[PDB]
Amino acid sequence: MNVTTPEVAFREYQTNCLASYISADPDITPSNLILQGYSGTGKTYTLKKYFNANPNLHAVWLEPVELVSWKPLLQAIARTVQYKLKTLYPNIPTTDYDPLQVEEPFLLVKTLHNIFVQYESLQEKTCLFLILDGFDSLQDLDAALFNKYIKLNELLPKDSKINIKFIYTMLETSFLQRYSTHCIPTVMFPRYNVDEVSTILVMSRCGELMEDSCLRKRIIEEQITDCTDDQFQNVAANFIHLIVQAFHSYTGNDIFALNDLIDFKWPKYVSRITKENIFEPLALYKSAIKLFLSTDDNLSQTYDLSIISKYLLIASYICSYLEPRYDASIFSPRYLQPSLFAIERLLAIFQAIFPMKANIEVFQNLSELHTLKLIATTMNKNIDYLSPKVRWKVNVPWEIIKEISESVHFNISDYF
Amino acid sequence: PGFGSLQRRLLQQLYGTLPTDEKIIFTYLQDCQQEIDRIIKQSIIQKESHSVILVGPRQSYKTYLLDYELSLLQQSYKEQFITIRLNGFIHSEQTAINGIATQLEQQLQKIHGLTEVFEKILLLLDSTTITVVFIFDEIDTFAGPVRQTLLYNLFDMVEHSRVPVCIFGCTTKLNILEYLEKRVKSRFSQRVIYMPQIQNLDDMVDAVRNLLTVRSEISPWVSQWNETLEKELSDPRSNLNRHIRMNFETFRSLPTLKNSIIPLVATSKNFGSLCTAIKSCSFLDIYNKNQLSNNLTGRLQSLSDLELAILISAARVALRAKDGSFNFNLAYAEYEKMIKAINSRIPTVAPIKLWLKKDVKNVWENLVQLDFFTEKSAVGLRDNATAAFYASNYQFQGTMIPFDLRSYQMQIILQELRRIIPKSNMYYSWTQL
Amino acid sequence: KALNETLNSHVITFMTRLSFTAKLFIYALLNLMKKNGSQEQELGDIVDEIKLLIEVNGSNKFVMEIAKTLFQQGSDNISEQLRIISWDFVLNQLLDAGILFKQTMKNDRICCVKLNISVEEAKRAMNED
Amino acid sequence: MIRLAEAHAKMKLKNVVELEDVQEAVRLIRSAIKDYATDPKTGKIDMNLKSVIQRKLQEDLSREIMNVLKDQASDSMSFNELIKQINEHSQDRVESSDIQEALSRLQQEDKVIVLGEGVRRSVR
Numbered sequence A: 001m002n003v004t005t006p007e008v009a010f011r012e013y014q015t016n017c018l019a020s021y022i023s024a025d026p027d028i029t030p031s032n033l034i035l036q037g038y039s040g041t042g043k044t045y046t047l048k049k050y051f052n053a054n055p056n057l058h059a060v061w062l063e064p065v066e067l068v069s070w071k072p073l074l075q076a077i078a079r080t081v082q083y084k085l086k087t088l089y090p091n092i093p094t095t096d097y098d099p100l101q102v103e104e105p106f107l108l109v110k111t112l113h114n115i116f117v118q119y120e121s122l123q124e125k126t127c128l129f130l131i132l133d134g135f136d137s138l139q140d141l142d143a144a145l146f147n148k149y150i151k152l153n154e155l156l157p158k159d160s161k162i163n164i165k166f167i168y169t170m171l172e173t174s175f176l177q178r179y180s181t182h183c184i185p186t187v188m189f190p191r192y193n194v195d196e197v198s199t200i201l202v203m204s205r206c207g208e209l210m211e212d213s214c215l216r217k218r219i220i221e222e223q224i225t226d227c228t229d230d231q232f233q234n235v236a237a238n239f240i241h242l243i244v245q246a247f248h249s250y251t252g253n254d255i256f257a258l259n260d261l262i263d264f265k266w267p268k269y270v271s272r273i274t275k276e277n278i279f280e281p282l283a284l285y286k287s288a289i290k291l292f293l294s295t296d297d298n299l300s301q302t303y304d305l306s307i308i309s310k311y312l313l314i315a316s317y318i319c320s321y322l323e324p325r326y327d328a329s330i331f332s333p334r335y336l337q338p339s340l341f342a343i344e345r346l347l348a349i350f351q352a353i354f355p356m357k358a359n360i361e362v363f364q365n366l367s368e369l370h371t372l373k374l375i376a377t378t379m380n381k382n383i384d385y386l387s388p389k390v391r392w393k394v395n396v397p398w399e400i401i402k403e404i405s406e407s408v409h410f411n412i413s414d415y416f
Numbered sequence B: 001p002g003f004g005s006l007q008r009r010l011l012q013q014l015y016g017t018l019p020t021d022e023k024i025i026f027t028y029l030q031d032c033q034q035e036i037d038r039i040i041k042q043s044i045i046q047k048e049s050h051s052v053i054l055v056g057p058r059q060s061y062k063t064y065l066l067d068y069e070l071s072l073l074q075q076s077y078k079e080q081f082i083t084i085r086l087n088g089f090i091h092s093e094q095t096a097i098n099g100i101a102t103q104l105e106q107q108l109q110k111i112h113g114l115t116e117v118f119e120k121i122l123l124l125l126d127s128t129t130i131t132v133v134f135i136f137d138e139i140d141t142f143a144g145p146v147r148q149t150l151l152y153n154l155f156d157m158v159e160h161s162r163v164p165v166c167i168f169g170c171t172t173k174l175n176i177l178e179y180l181e182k183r184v185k186s187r188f189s190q191r192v193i194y195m196p197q198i199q200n201l202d203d204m205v206d207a208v209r210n211l212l213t214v215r216s217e218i219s220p221w222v223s224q225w226n227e228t229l230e231k232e233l234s235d236p237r238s239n240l241n242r243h244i245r246m247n248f249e250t251f252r253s254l255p256t257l258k259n260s261i262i263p264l265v266a267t268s269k270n271f272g273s274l275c276t277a278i279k280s281c282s283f284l285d286i287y288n289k290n291q292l293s294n295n296l297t298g299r300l301q302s303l304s305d306l307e308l309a310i311l312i313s314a315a316r317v318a319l320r321a322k323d324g325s326f327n328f329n330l331a332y333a334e335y336e337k338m339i340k341a342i343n344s345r346i347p348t349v350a351p352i353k354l355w356l357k358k359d360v361k362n363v364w365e366n367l368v369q370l371d372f373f374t375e376k377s378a379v380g381l382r383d384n385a386t387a388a389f390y391a392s393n394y395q396f397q398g399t400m401i402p403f404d405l406r407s408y409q410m411q412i413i414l415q416e417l418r419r420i421i422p423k424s425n426m427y428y429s430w431t432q433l
Numbered sequence C: 001k002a003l004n005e006t007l008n009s010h011v012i013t014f015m016t017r018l019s020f021t022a023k024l025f026i027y028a029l030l031n032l033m034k035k036n037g038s039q040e041q042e043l044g045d046i047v048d049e050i051k052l053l054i055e056v057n058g059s060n061k062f063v064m065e066i067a068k069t070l071f072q073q074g075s076d077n078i079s080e081q082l083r084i085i086s087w088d089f090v091l092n093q094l095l096d097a098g099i100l101f102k103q104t105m106k107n108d109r110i111c112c113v114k115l116n117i118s119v120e121e122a123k124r125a126m127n128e129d
Numbered sequence D: 001m002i003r004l005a006e007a008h009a010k011m012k013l014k015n016v017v018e019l020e021d022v023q024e025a026v027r028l029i030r031s032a033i034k035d036y037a038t039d040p041k042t043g044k045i046d047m048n049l050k051s052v053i054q055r056k057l058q059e060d061l062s063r064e065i066m067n068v069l070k071d072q073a074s075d076s077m078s079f080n081e082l083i084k085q086i087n088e089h090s091q092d093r094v095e096s097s098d099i100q101e102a103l104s105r106l107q108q109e110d111k112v113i114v115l116g117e118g119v120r121r122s123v124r
């Protein structure tokens, strides 16, 4: 019955809680168990880490992340349970049931019952820990779904030698609070503190970066003579602390974004390394400064457009943010979303502001803008521009309209 | 080494899968337990036909009594009852019939080693002869506006079956007699039983005494365990007694307290450690705070400086708004304005960063996921699969409009922020308008 | 005896046997129904109306202990909560029993809550406490 | 508040202004404005000015009176002794009428014995 416990840092309470509720005897484990925590909390890490120290526990792993809807989730349970039972106890003569025949939860219960009856010849009652990771991460999800897996194993015959012991992992708190009356054993994961995130990153992603090809070049290029592994470890470790203290207020406390920033900035930081840069990381900071001054998560005269298109996009912004009351006076709410307008207004304002009549090039540029999605419409499928019901709005921010006005020498700044 | 025997015995009694000879019935339940048992024995032993619905909230021990009665009767009448189980959540209005058909055959196999379906079931029973037992959880689901043909047939079979027939229903609604249609309501025997609620602290103390005591000499420390349990339940100033009183005052579902206690017994490594833990009773506080760790305060304590400042600025805009709505542009404008004010109140020297609008996007994304914000009319998690289908078919405007102009509403009002945010925070002075 | 069990309703006695937090919830909801003349109250109203009802009597000594129970569960290691202990538990339990009606909205403050039972029997249940 | 504090002592014809003058002055302002009957977030007037919370307070007070009576090593105690032991021992002093009400309820339920005004005695 006794289960050994791995020493997972910053999850000691939860590791003790998983030492509870999980044991060989199915009479000492509950029918359902939920571990909850937002993304980047270590639940998928900790659960696997605990199962990897006690092989005798028969665990089945599935991920609703891959399994788009509930039908794959049902079918995978039967498939993987059957395969695992064959892998563990092969000598018993059994007959296969097609996992694609599981079209309903009742059929899942039927198939599980049949499989356990086929294994009835077992001497001892044993557990079967079916594991689902990120139940609420399922994309085709509704509230009523989870009760079906809460109240499942009581429809199984309790005489069976194999007992299913569900384990769930969840992200949101608004999902748990609809099921608090069931008193299901719950283990909680809070977001890590900064002191925890920094140490987790140092422990995890240090050696992997320490021996990358980029340094394999630079060490020989700089002809480092007295280098040892400890110096490598310290130099690599300083990078994580610098990035964390630089971008903590930007990323927050998430491991993933910090890892991505480290991945992007590590070759560039390594590039600045010289003979005099190591053993004085302060100089390394004082030379790679511009890496720590911009996030560099950006994917890369920003718009090069025809003059007619530029003035059309000026007039459309005027239409989208000027109240209709002023069209008869001025020409004769920035923070809010743009209002809708009609093409009749756009053409008139464009004619009134261009330094043109109705040649086809104007309409061609307008349709180009729509195809460029610099101007939006009130529809999603089967675009029917010529239908009178469609209305138009601007999909471009002010910061670009200002530059367009500068490039065409226009004075939108004086109309508001 | 021997401590493990008693430590496992305690857990095995706690989970409740005890042998019928060792099982426990709490005192306040016994009246309804006997009311149920009399009907069950009348239907099985004396071949009566009856239909009963049990009432009470979830985790009210409602099905535990039925399980105990069936486990008792299996000892003396093993060959004289057939049990049919149906659950409202798993079985739809279609899959119930197939479940009945499969379970009947499954029971018959180990026994021997809808206009006509029910009649043919009765004829097969007659030709093979045994009392048929029906158990329903979530009666209200079967008693919805969807046609109630299943229960309509089951309650009709009560006074017409040539084979003894018994039906038990389980649900938490109190308006069951209005859930059932007038046609079905007429046919039902209407012997409604409401589960007895814990209504005194003496009831809960006695329930704990019944649940945690050991009635046999499994371990030499059983006598010490029972004595210590009674001592802690006796002294009003015991930490365990205080926690039990708090539980009774707050919520009166006993299985919640059971599940709270389970980790304390499970974690115990030695008898001395068990005694010290149960006397101090401090680990329930740790359990309770972990139950609260992902609440609003717990999430708010984990945010960064810039995240907190942007949250405060968003809250200020929500407060000033007539409807509480706000967007990214207004939030960044207020963030810039407050940074300018903070810089201005710092005197200039004779001869704090405003983060770029692009960098603030990650902070906004972080806060939208942690549910501090919410979209203007976000329904959130839909209730049923059909609603999810119609929701996934439709395309909401809030998912199409730019990142800078999506309308949001606030979950933590500025007053709550001023309650929670430490005064040592630099941005605390802006928790007021 | 058969006629009595057909006529009598368990609603009132079940309410009188509810835990303290549920009775406090119903009392605060009735108080808001009186002070506003409305049928439904947002959780944004009720969560702080309970705080108001605790604070009005706050001059009493045992109000400190009941506040410690409701907002920190009687432990020093737990900080202030924006909900009373088991707010979710009792909120669901009243919905589970059919006493209460709640409208779907993923915002924990603008969500509206309405009684399903009649007002007079709720008043009677509150009077018997 | 200060002007009313001086005005009260002038009625008292006393050379100084003291706590009773200040507290009465504070109360008079409270009663004049009708503060406690006014909602603190809407400014509306409560036209009603025993709640369940009051019922709980009296329940716990009676139970604590029983606990103090049965826990002390004396079969009987005076109400002043009880006040010194509990009411004035911790937190600001509460009005003794509530203690008297609780012990009177217990006596009516025959849980405590009140032989006289000066003494309170345990159960028979």
Ligand SMILES: Nc1ncnc2c1ncn2[C@@H]1O[C@H](COP(=O)(O)OP(=O)(O)OP(=O)(O)O)[C@@H](O)[C@H]1O
Pocket (backbone or CB within 6 Å): A008, A009, A010, A011, A038, A039, A040, A041, A042, A043, A044, A045, A046, A134, A171, A200, A203, A204, A255
């Ligand atoms: N205590 C820890 N020590 C070291 N690394 C940890 C620890 N906890 C979490 N991690 C790291 O967290 C990373 C992310 O995995 P994690 O288990 O946190 O995901 P998750 O929260 O389950 O994700 P999702 O919701 O997307 O499924 C892992 O790669 C792991 O290295």
Ligand SMILES: Nc1ncnc2c1ncn2[C@@H]1O[C@H](COP(=O)(O)OP(=O)(O)OP(=O)(O)O)[C@@H](O)[C@H]1O
Pocket (backbone or CB within 6 Å): B015, B016, B017, B018, B056, B057, B058, B059, B060, B061, B062, B063, B064, B065, B067, B137, B138, B170, B171, B172, B255, B258
């Ligand atoms: N076979 C069993 N062995 C031990 N305990 C059981 C068993 N079945 C139920 N219980 C106990 O029942 C308690 C919860 O009540 P129960 O299971 O009777 O309600 P329910 O049928 O789920 O209720 P409802 O249908 O009203 O939601 C738990 O504490 C659990 O320990």
